[PDB]
Amino acid sequence: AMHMQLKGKTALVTGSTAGIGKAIATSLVAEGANVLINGRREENVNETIKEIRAQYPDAILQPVVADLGTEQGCQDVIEKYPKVDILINNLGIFEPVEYFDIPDEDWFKLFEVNIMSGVRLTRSYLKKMIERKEGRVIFIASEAAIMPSQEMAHYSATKTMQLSLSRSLAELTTGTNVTVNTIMPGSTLTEGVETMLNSLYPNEQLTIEEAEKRFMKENRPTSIIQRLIRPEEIAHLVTFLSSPLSSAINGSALRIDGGLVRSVF
Amino acid sequence: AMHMQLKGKTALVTGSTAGIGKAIATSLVAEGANVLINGRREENVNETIKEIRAQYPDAILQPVVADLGTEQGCQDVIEKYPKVDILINNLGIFEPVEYFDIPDEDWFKLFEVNIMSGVRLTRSYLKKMIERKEGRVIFIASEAAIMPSQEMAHYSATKTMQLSLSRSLAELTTGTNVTVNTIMPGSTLTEGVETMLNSLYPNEQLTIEEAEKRFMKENRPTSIIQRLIRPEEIAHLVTFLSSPLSSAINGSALRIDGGLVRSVF
Amino acid sequence: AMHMQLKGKTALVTGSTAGIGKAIATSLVAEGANVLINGRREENVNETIKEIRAQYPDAILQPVVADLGTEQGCQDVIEKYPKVDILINNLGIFEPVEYFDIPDEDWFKLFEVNIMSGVRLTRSYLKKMIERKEGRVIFIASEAAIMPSQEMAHYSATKTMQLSLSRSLAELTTGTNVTVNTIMPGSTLTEGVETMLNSLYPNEQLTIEEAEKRFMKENRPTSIIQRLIRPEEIAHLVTFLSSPLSSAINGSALRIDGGLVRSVF
Amino acid sequence: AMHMQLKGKTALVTGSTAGIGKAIATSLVAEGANVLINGRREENVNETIKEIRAQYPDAILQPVVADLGTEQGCQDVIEKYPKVDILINNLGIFEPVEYFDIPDEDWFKLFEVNIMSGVRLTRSYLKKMIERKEGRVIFIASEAAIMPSQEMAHYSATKTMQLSLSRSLAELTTGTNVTVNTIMPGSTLTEGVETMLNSLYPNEQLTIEEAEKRFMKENRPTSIIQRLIRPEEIAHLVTFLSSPLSSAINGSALRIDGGLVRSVF
């Protein structure tokens, strides 16, 4: 009674070369959606598509090599891929830099990359979805959008902003079956984190599992779950939201942070 | 890749004689969970179990006739049903009464019914779940917990409170795989609403579908979805949260209100 | 130059023989308001009244000895002081007890004390203020109302419920010059907290400043301001809100917690 | 009796030749503070300065003609007025344009104007205030920051982003007596809004009070207070926060919207 009726639907997953974006893509094609994988580097895109052909040899994949952080990257894609039934705004970059040190241009970069990507894309895909009363748009933000991270003012700002953008969009869907919602993942075990855990805690013969554990206890004491979230975990929800089974959720920001944010919300 | 591994798990759904509670029960047994249906009236419980045997003739149902709004109702159940792997706190009552008119005792009733039920039950089931590091507890609140309804101060208060209770519980699960979360449904087409729509709007030859529509536009202008949420809709999520697929959501309050609450949250 | 315009107004400060309550009162009497000091024990009411005059000889006070935590204390104060222009619902009371150890009895008590006191008093006063088009009601909650205290979930729930009650009440003042708001003070240096410090960090022989210092380090790592809040600092805000000056604030929940809650709110 | 203690302090009120900005300034000069009036056009700065003295002859002002919406205006004001004890980030600017009609260009503009003005100015001033242990920075957002305006999503995003920026900044003041907070005024009677009313409800010949009256009915049905907010009413709050009196408020977002946002917040 709980089918994800998303076979035959084309989903775009921006910056899905690795991490969450990769997890989300895999899960979605696993439910027979025609996933359009986007990444800046042509190598990274192909290499990802291979990891996937390997898992679902009967699958419809499409490499969308482009830079969605650039104005010209985006316009190419609305040209080359006019129809998109499910849009996941996963593209988002970051770099830790104490606040007084963030150069000015960096604020302009993180905004163009983490927001305009979403604005630019939806300016066409949502319009299109609205005319046909059908589809999803989901933003991948982070628990930072509510609890700003101490060494990423700007990133934290971009996340917080996404929420706004997300809600304003959700309200353009009045009457239809199109939902625009945002999810907020907590600390996930991406691949940069993966190896970050190797070098961290030296001098203490530690296993990488035991390592996650002390790292959480150490730098992320408010986590109830007490471990990184595996991409798959985020992917489950994203998929759920992608399905027409989630038609009652529109204009929401759902926290998927294993407890991080101490708030009754 | 998205299985709800909840076959063999016993789920308790308080006040599941009708409405959401009924929708949630059905969906859950539909995924092979051993559902324990609770209702105050012995008739209402049986009558519900029949509608269900009818749908899943190969199903494990258990009538739990009891009043979970009473102290003695609850203690009977922890006695008679010691093991519960999934606990849905659906029981909740209400009655519209202008604020200055709510008698005092009514505030005491709505609190005992809409909160103590949850407190009392979890005081044992959560404790138990924590010792075995496994299980879910979900609270069915309402978008009222954030946007209080004008003619239900007390009900609105009870909802708002649930959020707190929910978050405090989520924090007892530190380290385990037990999640305690709350969802907030919007205006749903229960059965009291169902017929409320019949008498409403007389004098205007209207179909009941067209009726929902003007009623939303009329008394619920902030809804993006523009129609009642069908119980099934809530049930989808509840089930999702019931599954171990949702292990990254702990201590959250997810809005499932089709847009009602105008908030970037 | 910004006139507080408090002279001639009658303010009832519940549970104000000590802590934040006592400070609140002091401030209003300083500002020319007519204040009614209320506590359960006659001893404390006069003692508090003595202090206040000892500082402001031209003070306008009125002792109100009643347990506003009872249906009857409330009935009495209402029959007796019919006209109140300003109602500060300060009366509140916590106790740390692990969730599974909280007796069922205890929930109703905090309920009646931290919530019904509010309800009862406002059922009568707010009604009056509205027919009169002018007035103020302010609820003193705590940062717990948003970030629950792991040591006392019941107290936490009542604080969260104040937020709902407050907002509904506010919505009733529609079209008038009456306002209803809530403030969430963080942890403050009240004799209660003072005692608890001497009490804790045992056998280290520490002067309250040293004592306060590491309690914030160990137990309130999240505070920006990094110290206990002096009672006076909360009064400042309440006095501002009591004034006509705050006319635009209505149905808000103002955080005054020295940065405790890590939320862009 | 509650001393605002503003004499001797230097306050920079960005974009304060009009509306809320102009009111804010007035209030601080009334309170003895040294105020720097800032606008893009030299004409307006002196005109505003004339008004203020016309009311307070002993006024301490200083004209700051610069476009704080530019990298260079900011650089100039910083090089020139190095020591500022109080920074009110009031400079902001909206425009109604349907989401799909908003030019890509426009996003960067509002970004640079409503956000970088904040960032740039604080990169310099807050840094200083912290090394000095004392200071205040306040951001003037709007109710949009929580409840987005359907007419201008870009302006909405920048208001929501202020909330993040504000909270991060706050967290940097850890251990000092510097505070960073944000206020969300609702709709106010600013000449801008005044013009728009004359402009709208055409051919009905309505005096501004009648005009204001139904605009709130039709367009702000959600307001409790039911009228436009007079600029003075926002200044009151900002002045309070500017004062040392508000020492306990840190990293908060205070709603001052006459009840617009229906949220227990």
With 0-12 / 13-18 / 19 or more C-beta atoms within 10 angstroms meaning exposed / middle / buried, residue A18 is middle
Give the minimum alpha-carbon distance from C263 to chain B in angstroms, rounded to a whole number: 11
Give the minimum alpha-carbon distance from B183 to chain A in angstroms, rounded to a whole number: 10
Structural tokens at position C208: 């309250």
**Catalytic residue ranges of A:** 155
Place of tokens 């604005």: A119
Spatial distance between the Cα atoms of B94 and B107, rounded to a whole number of angstroms: 11
Specify the resolution in Å.
2.8
Q: Which of B103, B59, B77 is nearest to B15 (CA)?
A: B77
Contact list in D for residue B145 (CB cut-off 8 A) is 264
Q: What are phi and psi of D238, to 5 degrees?
A: -60, -40
Structural tokens at position B249: 């959501």
With 0-12 / 13-18 / 19 or more C-beta atoms within 10 angstroms meaning exposed / middle / buried, residue B70 is middle
Question: Do A48 and A26 touch, CB atoms closer than 8 A?
Answer: no
Spatial distance between the Cα atoms of D144 and D163, rounded to a whole number of angstroms: 11
Could A246 and B226 be called an inter-chain contact, meaning their C-beta atoms sit closer than 8 Å? no
- Cα dihedral sign for C217, C219, C220, C226? negative
Question: Do C43 and C12 touch, CB atoms closer than 8 A?
Answer: no
Amino acid identity at A223: S
**Burial letters for A58-75: b for 16+ Cβ neighbours within 10 Å, e otherwise?**
ebebeebbbbbbbeebbe
Which CATH number belongs to the domain containing residue D246 in this structure? 3.40.50.720
Q: How many CB atoms lie within 10 A of CB B84?
A: 24
Which stretch of DSSP H or E encloses residue A193?
Answer: helix A191-199
Question: Helix, strand, or coil here: A164?
Answer: helix
Question: Do D92 and D118 touch, CB atoms closer than 8 A?
Answer: no
Q: Which of D68, D106, D69, D62 is nearest to D84 (CA)?
A: D62
Place of tokens 């804790």: C200
Place of tokens 């004001």: D77
Q: How many CB atoms lie within 10 A of CB D70?
A: 16
Place of tokens 């089931």: B125
Determined by X-ray
Q: HSE, CB side, 13 Å, CA atoms: give it for residue C253.
A: 25
Spatial distance between the Cα atoms of D167 and D252, rounded to a whole number of angstroms: 7
Question: Do D260 and D147 touch, CB atoms closer than 8 A?
Answer: yes
Spatial distance between the Cα atoms of D145 and D141, rounded to a whole number of angstroms: 7
Could D250 and C259 be called an inter-chain contact, meaning their C-beta atoms sit closer than 8 Å? yes
Spatial distance between the Cα atoms of B177 and B130, rounded to a whole number of angstroms: 9
Place of tokens 């309050």: B253
Question: Helix, strand, or coil here: C232?
Answer: helix
Spatial distance between the Cα atoms of D172 and D123, rounded to a whole number of angstroms: 11
Ramachandran category for residue C183: left, alpha or beta (phi over 0 → left; psi -120 to 50 → alpha): beta
With 0-12 / 13-18 / 19 or more C-beta atoms within 10 angstroms meaning exposed / middle / buried, residue A24 is buried
Q: How many CB atoms lie within 10 A of CB C79?
A: 9
Question: Do B159 and B142 touch, CB atoms closer than 8 A?
Answer: yes
- Cα dihedral sign for B184, B186, B188, B190? positive
Nearest-by-Cβ selection for D161 from A116, A127, A157? A157
Structural tokens at position B97: 């009464």
Question: Do A60 and A107 touch, CB atoms closer than 8 A?
Answer: no
Nearest-by-Cβ selection for B248 from A31, A164, A225? A225
Residues of D near B (CB-CB distance < 8 A)? 146-148, 160, 261-264
Give the minimum alpha-carbon distance from A9 to chain B in angstroms, rounded to a whole number: 18
**Burial letters for D154-186: b for 16+ Cβ neighbours within 10 Å, e otherwise?**
bbbbbbbbbbbbbbbbbbbbbebbbbbbbbbbb
Residues of B near C (CB-CB distance < 8 A)? 71, 99-100, 102, 104, 107-108, 111-112, 115-116, 119-120, 123, 126-127, 145, 148, 150, 153, 156-161, 163-165, 167-169, 171-172
DSSP-assigned beta bridge partners for residue C136: C86, C179
Amino acid identity at C216: M
Owning domain of residue B241 = 1-265
Place of tokens 């400070």: C23
Spatial distance between the Cα atoms of A238 and A231, rounded to a whole number of angstroms: 11
**Burial letters for A41-50: b for 16+ Cβ neighbours within 10 Å, e otherwise?**
eeebbeebbe
Spatial distance between the Cα atoms of D184 and C264, rounded to a whole number of angstroms: 12
Name the domain count of chain A. Answer: 1
Greatest extent of chain A over all pairs of C-alpha atoms, in Å: 60
